[PDB]
Amino acid sequence: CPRFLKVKNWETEVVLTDTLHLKSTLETGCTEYICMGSIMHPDVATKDQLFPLAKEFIDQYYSSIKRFGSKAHMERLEEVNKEIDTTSTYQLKDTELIYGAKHAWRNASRCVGRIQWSKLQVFDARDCTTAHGMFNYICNHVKYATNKGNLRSAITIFPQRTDGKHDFRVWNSQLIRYAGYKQPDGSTLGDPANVQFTEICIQQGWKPPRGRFDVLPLLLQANGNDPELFQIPPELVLEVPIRHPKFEWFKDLGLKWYGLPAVSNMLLEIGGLEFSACPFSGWYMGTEIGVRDYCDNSRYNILEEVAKKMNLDMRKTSSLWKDQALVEINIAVLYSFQSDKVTIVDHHSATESFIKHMENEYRCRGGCPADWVWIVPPMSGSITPVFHQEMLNYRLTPSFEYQPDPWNTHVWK
């Protein structure tokens, strides 16, 4: 690879220079002949594989604290090396854990919210042993991050992987999600994205309310044991009823959403260590709710019912009735969250912040990995400043990664 890569902004003509890509680690999926940039997703590590991965991370940490090559740096290297030799693994210090988690976010090429990356509250849950203890940690996480509507980003980090047979997992994809119920007639009640997980919960003993907005229980696996169900205390689940500043009939749709987006199915890799349970949360960009959660056809799919109440012509697509209704839905979502003093960011503000963040990273870090396909919002893309911004995508470590769904791999006891 060449040592400098240039990215241009075609709206502003600003040209930036990336050198950070020289530190990229794993693969993108692309090759010289094919680009897989729109592909969504393109038995543990041995002693020999772990040594270089740990040294690389330790070097990076000590370089970040301006202590590279110091006595403490060399001692930490040797202590890690000894520990890998005699135990086939090692343990991160709390400082390294915190640094690692913040940098996995800083490195998340698909995240538009990264201007916030250094303000992450990291909860160390590596002393957890049981699913009840996981539940306690997750409740405290949710209560802290929710903060009565003044949301704070947070991550809770459960014990790392050992042999792969003792994994901690949150079986939920997000901590807070609504159930979906497949009906005998083919229709779906609630959130259609969640039918499979909902059926699993019912098999594990969940008694479903069978409603439109039923918060799913947590399904929590500790130390490789079978997962266990826990109901989140409903007073910890902050929710926002959706109304519209102009359309009085919009409240009659009976819509609401929860305030806290919290991803719980990803894997945090730090120094070759694998944290298979690391729920993290921030706050919503409006379009995540208003465009996707409500208007995706395979989701709540309310565009038609909003358009009908707006009395648009729905017989020609060229009336753009869908686009009109989509904007009004996203107006209502932002207005409902702001009126209830629950933190939310519109896509204009978020993308402008991300451009400012990206420019600072280029100037201070030598680059900023970004996945344009994900960074550009799902509505009004070209009137946001990221649409015109060329981006380089590459994988830095520490990182968040996808992992298989645990019901596909779990060996039931």
Ligand X SMILES: Cc1cc(N)nc(CCc2cc(F)cc(CC[C@@H]3C[C@H](F)CN3C)c2)c1
Ligand Y SMILES: C[C@H](O)[C@H](O)[C@H]1CNc2nc(N)[nH]c(=O)c2N1
CA 43 to mean position of chain CA atoms: 25
Q: How far is CA 158 from its chain centroid? A: 17
What part of residues 4-33 is at the interface with ligand Y (CB under 6 A)?
A: 10
Using rule CB under 6 A, residue 265 touches ligand Y = no
Asked if residue 305 binds its own copies (CB under 8 A), the reply is: no
Interacting residues with Zn ion between 107 and 136 (CB under 5 A): none
Q: Is residue 114 annotated as part of the catalytic site, yes or no?
A: yes
Is 1 noted as a catalytic residue in this protein? no
54 binds ligand HEM (CB under 6 A): no
Alpha helical stretches, state H, 280-346: 286-287, 294-295, 303-310, 321-339
**Other CB atoms closer than 10 Å to residue 122's CB: what's the count?**
19
Closer residue to ligand X in complex, CB, 62/123: 123
Q: Is 262 one of the binding residues for ligand X (CB under 6 A)?
A: yes
Structure tokens at 229: 């169900």
Cα–Cα distance, 371 to 6 (Å, whole number)? 16
Query: What part of residues 283-322 is at the interface with ligand X (CB under 6 A)?
Result: 283-285, 288, 292-293
CA atoms of 266 and 261, how far apart (whole Å): 14
Q: Among Zn ion, its own copies, ligand X, none, what does residue 396 contact (CB within 5–8 Å per kind)?
A: none
Q: Please pick, from the candidates 159, 192, 282, 367, the single residue that binds ligand HEM as defined by CB under 6 A.
A: 282
The Cβ of residue 10 has, within 10 Å, a number of other Cβ atoms equal to 10
Asked if 371 and 110 count as a contact pair (C-beta separation under 8 A), the reply is yes
Q: Phi and psi at residue 292, in whole multiples of 5°?
A: -90, -55
Which partner, ligand HEM, ligand X, ligand Y, none, binds residue 174 by CB below 5 to 8 Å per kind?
ligand X
Out of ligand X, ligand Y, Zn ion, none, what residue 30 binds, judged by CB under 5 to 8 A for its kind, is Zn ion
288 is catalytic: yes
**Quick check: 259 binds ligand X (CB under 6 A)?**
no
DSSP state of 159: P
From 46-54, 114-122, 197-205, 318-326, span contacting its own copies (CB under 8 A): 318-326
Q: How far is CA 7 from the centre of its chain?
A: 26
Q: Which of 105, 283, 321, 372 is catalytic?
A: 283
Residues 41, 59: Cα–Cα separation, whole Å? 30
Please give the Cα distance from 395 to 393 (Å, whole number): 7
Q: Is 224 near its own copies (CB under 8 A)? A: no
Kindly state the helix (H) or strand (E) to which residue 228 belongs, with its residue range. Answer: strand 228-230
Report the candidate in 43, 44, 128 with the shortest Cα–Cα distance to residue 84: 44
Task: Say if strands 267-270 and 273-275 run parallel, antiparallel, or are unpaired.
Answer: antiparallel
Q: Is 288 annotated as a binding residue?
A: yes
| Residues 6+ positions from 316 with CB-CB distance below 8 Å | none
374 binds, among ligand Y, its own copies, ligand X, none (CB under 5 to 8 A by kind): ligand Y
Q: Which one, of 288, 285, 286, 322, lies nearest residue 306 by Cα?
A: 322
Residue 372 phi, psi (nearest 5) = -55, -45
**Catalytic annotation present for 412:** no
294 is a contact residue toward ligand HEM (CB under 6 A): no
CA distance 195 to 120: 32
Site residues for ligand Y, 368-407, by CB under 6 A, read 373-374, 387-390
Site string for Zn ion, 8-47 (x = CB under 5 A): ----------------------x----x-x----------
Q: Which residues participate in catalysis according to the annotation?
A: 111, 114, 283, 288
Interface residue list for ligand Y (CB under 6 A): 10, 38, 40, 373-374, 387-390
Residues in binding site for heme b: 111, 402
Interface residue list for ligand HEM (CB under 6 A): 105, 108, 110-113, 116, 120, 153, 155, 280, 282-283, 285, 288, 345, 350, 374, 400
Residues in binding site for L-arginine: 174, 283-284, 288
Interface residue list for its own copies (CB under 8 A): 1, 5, 7-8, 10-11, 21, 24-40, 286, 291-292, 295-298, 303, 317-320, 322-324, 326-327, 330-331, 334-335, 338, 346, 348-349, 372-373, 376-383, 387, 389-395
